[PDB]
Amino acid sequence: ERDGLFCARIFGPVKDYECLCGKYKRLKHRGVICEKCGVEVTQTKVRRERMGHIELASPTAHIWFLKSLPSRIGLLLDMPLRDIERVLYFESYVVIEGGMTNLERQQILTEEQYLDALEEFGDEFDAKMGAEAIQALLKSMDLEQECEQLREELNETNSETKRKKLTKRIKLLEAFVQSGNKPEWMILTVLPVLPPDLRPLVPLDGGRFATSDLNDLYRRVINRNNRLKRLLDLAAPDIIVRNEKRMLQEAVDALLDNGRRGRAITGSNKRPLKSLADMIKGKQGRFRQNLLGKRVDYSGRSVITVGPYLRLHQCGLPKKMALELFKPFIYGKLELRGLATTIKAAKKMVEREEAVVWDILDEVIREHPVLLNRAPTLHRLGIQAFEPVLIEGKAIQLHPLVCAAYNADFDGDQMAVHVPLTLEAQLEARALMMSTNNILSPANGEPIIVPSQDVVLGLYYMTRDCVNAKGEGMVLTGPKEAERLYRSGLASLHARVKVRITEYEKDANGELVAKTSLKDTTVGRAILWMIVPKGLPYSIVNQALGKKAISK
Amino acid sequence: IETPITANFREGLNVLQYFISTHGARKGLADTALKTANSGYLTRRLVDVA
Amino acid sequence: IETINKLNRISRQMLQEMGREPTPEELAERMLMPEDKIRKVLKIAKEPISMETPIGDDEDSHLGDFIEDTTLELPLDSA
Amino acid sequence: YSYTEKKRIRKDFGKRPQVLDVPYLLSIQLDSFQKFIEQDPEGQYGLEAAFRSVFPIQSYSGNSELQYVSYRLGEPVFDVQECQIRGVTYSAPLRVKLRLVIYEREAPEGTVKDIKEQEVYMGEIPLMTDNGTFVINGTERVIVSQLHRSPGVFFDSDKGKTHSSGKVLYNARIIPYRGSWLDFEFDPKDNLFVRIDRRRKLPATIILRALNYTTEQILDLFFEKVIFEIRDNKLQMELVPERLRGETASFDIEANGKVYVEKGRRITARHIRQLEKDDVKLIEVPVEYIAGKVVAKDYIDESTGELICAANMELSLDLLAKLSQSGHKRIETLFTNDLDHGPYISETLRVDPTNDRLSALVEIYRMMRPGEPPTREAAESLFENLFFSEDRYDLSAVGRMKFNRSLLREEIEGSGILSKDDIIDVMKKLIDIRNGKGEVDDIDHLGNRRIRSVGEMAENQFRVGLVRVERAVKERLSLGDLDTLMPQDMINAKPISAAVKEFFGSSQLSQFMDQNNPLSEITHKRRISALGPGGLTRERAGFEVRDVHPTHYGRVCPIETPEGPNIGLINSLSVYAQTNEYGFLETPYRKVTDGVVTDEIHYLSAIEEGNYVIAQANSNLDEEGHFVEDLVTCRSKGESSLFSRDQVDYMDVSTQQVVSVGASLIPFLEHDDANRALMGANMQRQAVPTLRADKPLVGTGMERAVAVDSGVTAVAKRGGVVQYVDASRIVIKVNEDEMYPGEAGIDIYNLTKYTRSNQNTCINQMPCVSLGEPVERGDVLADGPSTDLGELALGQNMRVAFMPWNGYNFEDSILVSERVVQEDRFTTIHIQELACVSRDTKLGPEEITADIPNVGEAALSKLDESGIVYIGAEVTGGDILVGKVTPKGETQLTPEEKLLRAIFGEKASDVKDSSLRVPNGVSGTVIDVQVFTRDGVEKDKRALEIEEMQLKQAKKDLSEELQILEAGLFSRIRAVLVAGGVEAEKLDKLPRDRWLELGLTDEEKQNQLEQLAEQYDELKHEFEKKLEAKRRKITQGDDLAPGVLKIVKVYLAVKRRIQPGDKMAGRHGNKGVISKINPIEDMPYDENGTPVDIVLNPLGVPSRMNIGQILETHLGMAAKGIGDKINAMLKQQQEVAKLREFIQRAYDLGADVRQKVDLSTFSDEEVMRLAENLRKGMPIATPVFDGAKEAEIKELLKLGDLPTSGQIRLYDGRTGEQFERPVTVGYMYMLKLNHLVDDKMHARSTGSYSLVTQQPLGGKAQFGGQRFGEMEVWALEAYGAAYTLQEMLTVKSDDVNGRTKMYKNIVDGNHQMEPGMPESFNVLLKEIRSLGINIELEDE
């Protein structure tokens, strides 16, 4: 409608550069106000960054300015919350400023007391109802005089409670003065309207309409404002005016903070509407759902797989992940070499799954980082980067040694895959969050690899001894001879066999010291020493290798 | 409990000992399942502080 | 609103007499009006659904993000 | 022994005999459904109680009334199959007989003015099938066993954690069924406070004063009176000698004698009995003892006339002097001296400022609704309607019984409202418990909570609907005319039907039936949920409620409940438990009379269980005699101890009475942990059927009952000779003993093939009976989706070896072989629904045209002239299924596209392309399409094809029945003609339809022939009427959603073979995942014939404190050895007698067996069929908590010519080396959840976004991005990375310009970021500005 909530004249056009009546085609016409509908031909995103306003008849007190602790309104006015509540809800009248010596500012009178005091005097007893009285009091009050009075009173008495109260009041007054705000701005005469894009009204797929509770709240507020205007224009009685003002105050409250001081407004079916206070304060609010963490493009979730099939800084990914995430790079490097005509044809060629598509994807995945995630991400090791390799089976493989880093056992969990696009992010993921660079835990200087695997138990068994059964009673020259003797199927890895171990120790400057001697050991321990490079002593592997042993 | 279990999982158990250990097993399970959230709240607080 | 109220009062007697939902053909024959008007009234007379209605039995995810944005274009057509 | 048991016999290792009868699993459901509907004039159950409590209704005038007579249940309109296919709510109409009786205003009781009666339709009520499904909108929903507390009074104590000094306080809550609860709590100031609906705390005496009670009456009812006498110089009292318990004597007690009690010493028991034997009557007590007490009654002044001293006043010297001068020498004083009593009511009276009943009513009215002036009439009416109203305040008959049992009353039946003495008795019991006499009631006790079933929920919904409709009737009757208005136009059927539909479609209890396997349906219908409306919430639940109470023995299964936030809240009802008429769970026991266990069974509740003693089922039965051990272990009051023979009261039936089926199906339950058993039960109830169902080798003894009570198999209600067998229809001839003379003795059963559910799988009914095999009542003629012959086949039996590998059994994973995939093992069938709807727009009607622009022959070769895929076509993800076009208006185009169109010169008509496509990665085959249109739109020559196909598929069973009946009638006519005359050669040559035209002699045979002709005509008319009714139902079954022209459902079927990425587990809970599929060559193998198929991980097995799968593997190895021996003996034709002897010797191996195998009475063909069935290994069974020891396992291994150790070395399929230690190998039964990697895996780069935030959506169906929470943000902050965080946050979630610039740079090969401003930040700024806050781009 030409005067509705999301009217095209106030908030701009609905479609992309199109008027209301569909007359202003030829997008060239920009900024031309129509004579029939009056719609400025602009883009659709204009409605996103603009808002409206509502002209109210009677001023309204901001609910969250006095309901929020410690009731800053009552602190600035030196009045408890019950009194300002009785004043705002039109339960009792308050004296704004009394020229006579009978009463002064901040004096409450009931219905009978007001009538008794009004029949005696006249033309000097200033008293209004709720919001108007509070606005007049905030306008007539002086901040400097009150600050001077408080500073003079604090020098005389030093009562702890009263001193702290006056100190907090002086702090609030000084902050209000230095902020440059005006006390008249506390009341509300013209309230803003939420942009139409933040409160959408689109038809659902089921042939029905999906409305918003904020639209209903704004409609209620507008209806109450129109009723108040019609009552004021027709000289409504005092009781009806008070009731309408109370209803308008309740509507403003429900629009700002729906149902926290009393009973919430009944919603559509059974549940009450949520207001902006619920969208800001609640756990499902915008802060911890669209600012800190939210949905991200170029992402995926997949199932884990149990098999190394690669090296430490590499992981196994199915063809599809890059089937759906690396397609922009596919199109880019297709336009690079020119194997495809256009992007629209390259999309169809990828949808046909040709062999050249996979041949190009193999180069797309060549040396490309990818972030793996396990929910929840408690410590730093929950976010690491690797490089994928195309395999069969549509489940992502996980590194065996990062099971203690992600704290995710192979019981059928789900891993998150993310792809960095910018060279900056790719380089900072390749350098910083690599499994080779980040090997220690952030908690202590110990290696985070404290493993499971009765496989490793069998390693420990290799590092064990046994009976003197067939195979013991020889001497071997090096670990390779023991490896050959064990692989040929001649003896076990428990034979007490002296091995000619050539051990290397670091020098005082950083060089290596070569020394060869015989060591009484077994075959498995010799194989383990062979696995150990030429940079560690032999006295550490000479004992049983358990959990703490391999950790050390 | 005053009367403990005498058998083990190798020779088998009866209904009494199984029912008397189940209410402790599920008790611990519910305890850790409810504390996995208090731990997350503590992590949230510690991240917000520092 | 008056036409909808009359149609509802007629459907109330139709369901009391027959026991089944009132068919549009019989309603149009009794109202002496074409079926197009009855169809349009039955289509328009529907209360809009709220935006915070939970999709499932659990009150975990509401209807906040369940509708796709088919108004603006996508990067594909832009490129 | 039935034929289903004769096909194959399960070796049961039962130590104790089974004397009870296995009850029906889904018994509570059907019992409640009957009690809610079945007509009962004397029973107050369901609609009867509803119309008895609501009607007769009284209006304000009281001249016209509406009385209830009875109700009538309608007939089902459509069949269950039609309601499931189309989507119509299966229900029956309801007709209630209501009488309108109008009295006269002139005559006092003149009721001869208007008396009418009529049947009114109040709406439809959804019925229940044999299984228990609720067909709502074409979906099978189920409401299941809400758990709440029984209405009554509950006394509890505060176990600290909220106090000021640390004093144990008490409270008593009244839980009603409809109304507001009352809470009587003890204030830490030793005061009794009352709360109504948790609004405001009032004194405890205001409610008593509101019931017309004075102070003296309250003091007399609560406290006791003691008489004090005075004769001008003394203070004598009638002291009872048994009241001096715990009283310090402050004077010398002298009662006509010497000093009895010394001054300073307390009163002892010996002094009590001495003074009692002395017969003390009067004691001269000093003045200090009396001065300081509280009077009981009001002593008026006979001289003046005013009140000298009122009640509840402390005594003093002047008061005693005035009372002595007035003449009151019989002072009645209360007795409050020690902990035996308490002056709490006195303090309550002192605090309470009210004086009379009027002030009490005023205070109650001010508390209930503040801000309103209190009036006498309105307050009195409110106080009478809140609690003293029958239609408003009434809990239950069970509620009244519980109230009387709590107050220790004698009668268990009373009124529905509370009286003036019930509250007084409750307060007296509460103060007695406070004094230290009673006991605090427990909440976890089953005697304090109850279950609300389908019947009670439906009754509550009907009560709400009837209250709403009676409010409407009261609104409509007080204004309308009493003569021209009919009762059919006053009552509207919209509110009741709307409430019923809301309850059956959107309530928390109404959940979709998990139809993965029949075991899931059983454990879901036999569930008990404590979440939903009426009970506690997910957040309110704490630790004290979720713990298993010792009273849950044999009632609630403690090892079957979903984990996470719903742990210990939604449990499984045990097998032998049953819900009585009061709503409490009970378990059948056996009477023990002086050690002799008889066949007498008595059901006991929790309160009745906590009083007697129960002996466990492990006691040895001495051939129907007494106990063997002198000290038998038994349980009572929550403690187990050794009792003698005469101390045994009841005995349990078996050991499976505590654990339900879904958790007791484990072969070895006592060898597993509680958490392990819970996880195994969950993995078993969430299992998925396979392609070829095979019975499990290891199992239990109650699987037959579950398979026959699941209701998915063919239930033989009569039993007889099966005549015709087919893949979809089976007929069976009922025997002459059960054949009724009225109807025909032939039963037809239609096999439901590939039924659609909300858990899409392969749901079919495969026939099992052959041609010429008779069956009896209670057999299985056809199996289901996950049921084998007489058993419930969930997964599949495969070989499993416990040994490490090169990393394929890293952490509790599953490594499989290639033969599993080659033999189609672990293969399912998925059915994905795809619905294309046709809706007309505001600018153009919607049409369906096969001709789609920009579509070649590739996509049109598999489409009909209308645009529908041929039934039987194999499609791949990306093909168009339904051709739908939309008219498009004049759309503006960019000058580039205009120049391109001018260059090419093509037409390019404005027609949208909104046709339905197959989702990516889905290559399957369409089973059958369904086209649903409204009555206005014509079928358009397309639905006619499927309609004719359905009609050809139909008219089969009806035609066969008609032909059989006609043949029987012709045989009867031939028999009558033979009995009448000699007609043998002139009947077969003549046609069958020309037998009624032959005219015989004028005798009784002519009349018989005429009667038979009339019967044939009646049968033909009945067939024609049935055909007309079927056609009418088909015609009227064209209901469509408003604003919808046509709906085309595809129901695409996909094979989805086994591939790595699926979760697999067993019954003990060995959950994992398919690591890889290695070929049969690279797998370990045995010495002779059995290569290893599955390799498990022995890492996490010994750490989870459960043997389990080890014993299962050993028993499976024994069964496989027995089966291999049977197969080897069957491959030769040596002798059938040798096979019989071997089978007998194998089945008679158990020393103490429960069931004796009878094989000598079987024939040769039966033994051959048994051997052919056991070729795949004999099914070994064992009861719950009663498993065979290791000795019996070793004996069974030795029987099948296997090593007694059960651990055999293997050979590696890669190098061929022999391992050091042998390997534990054997057959096991593996299962798998849905957990499909095709559905779990979901990734997207670009796509649809949100509206308010322009952010991607979340979910597989949504096809959107993935959530990036704050934990990953903190992890990135801990790192030195700064670009990844911002790239994921701002230019991938909301900023359209940034993401489109990045896309343009990537498609052109630039890899540039160019960050911008987040749209979510702008949204937050606008949201903050909406509140009236100024934030305007603070620059540098």
Side-chain angles (χ1 to χ4, degrees), chain A residues 469-480:
Chain A
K470 172 183 175 300
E472 178 182 344
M474 299 179 60
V475 181
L476 303 178
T477 53
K480 59 269 300 180

Side-chain angles (χ1 to χ4, degrees), chain D residues 185-365:
Chain D
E185 64 175 1
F186 287 92
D187 192 71
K189 294 298 182 300
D190 298 330
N191 298 327
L192 188 62
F193 285 165
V194 177
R195 296 92 55 83
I196 296 90
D197 204 4
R198 291 88 180 185
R199 297 182 179 271
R200 199 267 181 271
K201 302 180 282 77
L202 286 187
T205 181
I206 179 178
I207 180 179
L208 300 180
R209 292 180 179 269
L211 301 181
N212 189 21
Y213 283 98
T214 59
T215 302
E216 52 183 6
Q217 296 180 0
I218 296 178
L219 295 182
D220 192 12
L221 292 180
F222 285 86
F223 300 94
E224 300 179 358
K225 297 180 177 180
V226 183
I227 301 180
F228 293 163
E229 300 180 0
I230 299 171
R231 309 175 185 269
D232 300 330
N233 202 21
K234 295 178 181 180
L235 308 171
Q236 300 174 348
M237 63 176 301
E238 301 179 0
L239 178 59
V240 190
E242 65 180 0
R243 297 183 181 179
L244 296 180
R245 179 76 281 271
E247 180 176 352
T248 300
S250 60
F251 60 94
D252 300 330
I253 299 180
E254 179 181 0
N256 191 21
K258 74 281 300 180
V259 180
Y260 297 151
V261 180
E262 301 179 0
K263 194 269 180 180
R265 296 299 180 269
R266 300 177 65 259
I267 302 299
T268 56
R270 50 265 300 269
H271 294 65
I272 287 180
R273 58 95 59 180
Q274 179 181 0
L275 274 305
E276 181 180 0
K277 190 263 300 180
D278 292 330
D279 300 330
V280 178
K281 268 66 180 60
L282 299 175
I283 293 182
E284 301 179 0
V285 294
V287 192
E288 185 180 0
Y289 183 82
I290 299 185
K293 299 300 180 180
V294 178
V295 297
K297 295 179 58 180
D298 298 327
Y299 299 92
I300 62 180
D301 190 8
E302 60 180 1
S303 300
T304 60
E306 298 292 338
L307 300 179
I308 300 181
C309 54
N312 200 113
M313 297 300 180
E314 300 180 0
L315 293 177
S316 180
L317 300 180
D318 53 355
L319 298 182
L320 290 180
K322 293 179 181 180
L323 291 180
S324 61
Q325 293 180 0
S326 59
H328 297 274
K329 304 174 179 180
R330 290 88 183 270
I331 302 179
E332 300 181 1
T333 309
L334 303 181
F335 184 83
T336 53
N337 299 330
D338 201 69
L339 300 180
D340 193 11
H341 301 270
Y344 301 154
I345 307 300
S346 182
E347 301 292 337
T348 299
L349 292 172
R350 289 186 178 93
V351 173
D352 175 66
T354 67
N355 184 25
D356 53 353
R357 183 181 180 180
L358 181 60
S359 59
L361 294 180
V362 166
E363 184 69 21
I364 292 180
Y365 190 86

Side-chain angles (χ1 to χ4, degrees), chain D residues 265 409 522 551 579 728 911 979 991 1095 1114 1176 1199 1230 1276:
Chain D
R265 296 299 180 269
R409 299 298 182 89
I522 292 300
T551 54
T579 62
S728 51
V911 173
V1095 176
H1114 285 65
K1176 285 81 179 300
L1199 178 66
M1230 290 296 186
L1276 296 180

Side-chain angles (χ1 to χ4, degrees), chain D residues 947-1135:
Chain D
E947 185 67 26
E948 294 293 336
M949 181 181 60
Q950 181 67 21
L951 262 298
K952 292 180 180 300
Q953 186 272 348
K955 296 181 178 180
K956 195 268 186 302
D957 299 330
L958 300 180
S959 300
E960 286 186 342
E961 185 270 348
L962 180 60
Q963 290 180 0
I964 292 180
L965 188 53
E966 187 180 0
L969 183 58
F970 287 162
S971 300
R972 181 180 180 180
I973 294 180
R974 180 181 179 180
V976 171
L977 293 182
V978 169
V982 181
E983 296 291 338
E985 299 181 0
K986 297 182 298 300
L987 297 181
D988 300 330
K989 300 180 180 180
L990 299 181
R992 299 298 181 270
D993 54 354
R994 297 183 181 180
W995 290 1
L996 301 180
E997 301 179 0
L998 181 60
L1000 298 182
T1001 60
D1002 301 330
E1003 208 181 0
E1004 300 292 337
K1005 56 260 300 180
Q1006 182 68 21
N1007 184 25
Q1008 294 180 0
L1009 183 61
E1010 292 180 0
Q1011 292 293 339
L1012 292 174
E1014 293 180 0
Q1015 180 68 21
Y1016 181 82
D1017 298 330
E1018 180 68 23
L1019 295 174
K1020 187 262 300 180
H1021 177 60
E1022 181 182 0
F1023 181 82
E1024 181 180 0
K1025 180 182 300 180
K1026 290 193 298 295
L1027 178 59
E1028 180 68 23
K1030 290 296 299 300
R1031 295 191 63 178
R1032 182 184 298 101
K1033 293 178 182 180
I1034 292 180
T1035 302
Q1036 297 293 339
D1038 54 354
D1039 190 9
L1040 237 298
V1044 181
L1045 299 181
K1046 293 182 178 300
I1047 297 181
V1048 181
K1049 301 181 181 61
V1050 183
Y1051 293 157
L1052 208 166
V1054 182
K1055 179 202 302 179
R1056 197 164 298 180
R1057 56 170 59 258
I1058 170 181
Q1059 55 182 350
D1062 301 330
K1063 174 183 274 70
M1064 296 181 59
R1067 276 76 63 87
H1068 303 287
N1070 46 16
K1071 59 179 180 300
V1073 71
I1074 303 177
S1075 57
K1076 284 184 77 281
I1077 302 184
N1078 295 124
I1080 61 180
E1081 294 80 359
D1082 300 330
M1083 297 294 299
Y1085 51 96
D1086 74 325
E1087 297 184 359
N1088 301 329
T1090 61
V1092 179
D1093 302 329
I1094 303 182
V1095 176
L1096 279 190
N1097 163 260
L1099 177 270
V1101 177
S1103 59
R1104 297 170 184 270
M1105 54 180 297
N1106 55 332
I1107 301 299
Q1109 46 187 335
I1110 280 80
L1111 293 176
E1112 179 173 358
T1113 301
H1114 285 65
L1115 198 51
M1117 156 172 279
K1120 179 55 175 180
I1122 293 184
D1124 292 328
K1125 292 298 298 300
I1126 292 180
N1127 183 25
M1129 295 180 63
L1130 258 62
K1131 287 184 300 180
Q1132 54 184 172
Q1133 289 74 12
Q1134 38 180 0
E1135 183 68 22

Side-chain angles (χ1 to χ4, degrees), chain D residues 697-698 799-800 1086 1090 1110-1124 1178 1180 1193 1196-1197 1200-1210 1223-1228:
Chain D
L697 298 181
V698 288
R799 193 175 184 90
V800 166
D1086 74 325
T1090 61
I1110 280 80
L1111 293 176
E1112 179 173 358
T1113 301
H1114 285 65
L1115 198 51
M1117 156 172 279
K1120 179 55 175 180
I1122 293 184
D1124 292 328
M1178 61 92 182
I1180 171 66
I1193 299 180
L1196 191 62
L1197 288 172
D1201 300 330
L1202 300 178
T1204 60
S1205 60
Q1207 191 182 353
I1208 178 63
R1209 67 273 180 180
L1210 305 175
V1223 190
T1224 299
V1225 201
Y1227 269 12
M1228 201 189 301

Side-chain angles (χ1 to χ4, degrees), chain D residues 131 133 513-514 517-526 710:
Chain D
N131 305 334
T133 79
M513 176 192 307
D514 302 0
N517 46 24
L519 194 273
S520 184
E521 178 180 0
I522 292 300
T523 190
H524 184 61
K525 293 183 175 303
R526 207 162 46 91
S710 60

Side-chain angles (χ1 to χ4, degrees), chain A residues 103-375:
Chain A
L103 297 179
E104 296 183 359
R105 304 181 180 181
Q106 303 177 0
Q107 290 293 338
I108 305 178
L109 297 179
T110 62
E111 180 177 354
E112 301 292 338
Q113 298 177 356
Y114 182 83
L115 296 180
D116 294 330
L118 185 60
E119 297 179 0
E120 299 181 0
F121 298 89
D123 300 330
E124 296 181 1
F125 183 81
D126 300 330
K128 292 180 179 180
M129 41 180 60
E132 300 181 0
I134 291 189
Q135 181 180 0
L137 180 60
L138 293 176
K139 183 180 80 284
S140 60
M141 63 181 298
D142 192 4
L143 301 180
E144 300 291 338
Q145 297 180 0
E146 294 183 1
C147 290
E148 292 180 0
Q149 290 180 0
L150 295 181
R151 291 181 179 181
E152 291 292 337
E153 289 180 0
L154 279 180
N155 188 26
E156 301 179 0
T157 60
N158 49 15
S159 180
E160 300 292 338
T161 60
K162 288 189 292 296
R163 185 180 183 272
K164 292 190 301 297
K165 175 62 179 60
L166 298 187
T167 303
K168 293 189 299 297
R169 186 177 179 183
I170 289 183
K171 290 179 181 180
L172 292 180
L173 290 177
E174 181 180 0
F176 185 84
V177 168
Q178 296 180 0
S179 60
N181 301 330
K182 299 181 60 180
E184 189 179 0
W185 296 353
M186 183 178 300
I187 212 71
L188 300 180
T189 60
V190 178
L191 49 88
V193 186
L194 192 73
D197 295 333
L198 303 185
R199 41 186 184 89
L201 179 60
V202 294
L204 203 129
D205 302 330
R208 45 183 171 88
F209 299 151
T211 185
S212 180
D213 53 353
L214 301 178
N215 295 330
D216 302 330
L217 295 180
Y218 273 93
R219 180 178 65 258
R220 295 183 179 95
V221 171
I222 290 185
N223 292 328
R224 289 190 177 88
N225 185 24
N226 296 330
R227 284 184 286 268
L228 177 61
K229 290 190 296 295
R230 293 186 301 180
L231 289 175
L232 292 180
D233 294 330
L234 296 180
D238 301 330
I239 299 300
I240 302 184
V241 167
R242 295 169 188 175
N243 184 263
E244 185 65 29
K245 289 183 177 180
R246 181 181 295 101
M247 290 168 50
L248 180 62
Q249 180 180 180
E250 182 185 10
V252 173
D253 295 4
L255 181 60
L256 297 177
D257 199 328
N258 185 22
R260 70 156 53 203
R261 75 280 182 270
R263 301 186 298 101
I265 302 300
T266 60
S268 60
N269 42 17
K270 75 280 180 60
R271 63 104 194 86
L273 306 320
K274 53 98 184 180
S275 60
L276 316 178
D278 297 330
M279 300 175 59
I280 292 299
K281 187 71 169 300
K283 184 180 180 300
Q284 41 76 34
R286 302 286 80 90
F287 287 89
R288 55 185 301 179
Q289 197 178 3
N290 304 120
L291 305 177
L292 280 310
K294 61 272 187 63
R295 277 70 186 267
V296 179
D297 291 327
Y298 297 86
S299 58
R301 291 285 285 185
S302 303
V303 199
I304 62 184
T305 319
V306 182
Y309 199 72
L310 294 99
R311 64 186 305 177
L312 190 139
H313 63 77
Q314 293 181 359
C315 60
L317 266 66
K319 302 193 174 185
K320 324 322 169 57
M321 188 64 56
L323 181 143
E324 195 68 22
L325 297 187
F326 287 180
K327 20 183 300 180
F329 298 93
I330 288 179
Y331 304 149
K333 287 205 285 298
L334 265 166
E335 283 189 331
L336 180 60
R337 272 82 70 171
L339 297 183
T341 61
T342 55
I343 46 180
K344 192 179 185 303
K347 295 172 185 299
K348 301 180 61 180
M349 292 179 60
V350 171
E351 290 179 0
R352 259 74 68 88
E353 292 86 26
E354 299 181 0
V356 293
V357 180
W358 308 119
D359 296 330
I360 296 180
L361 188 55
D362 181 70
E363 301 292 337
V364 175
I365 208 174
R366 207 278 186 271
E367 293 293 337
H368 188 260
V370 52
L371 280 71
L372 284 74
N373 177 31
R374 204 286 178 106

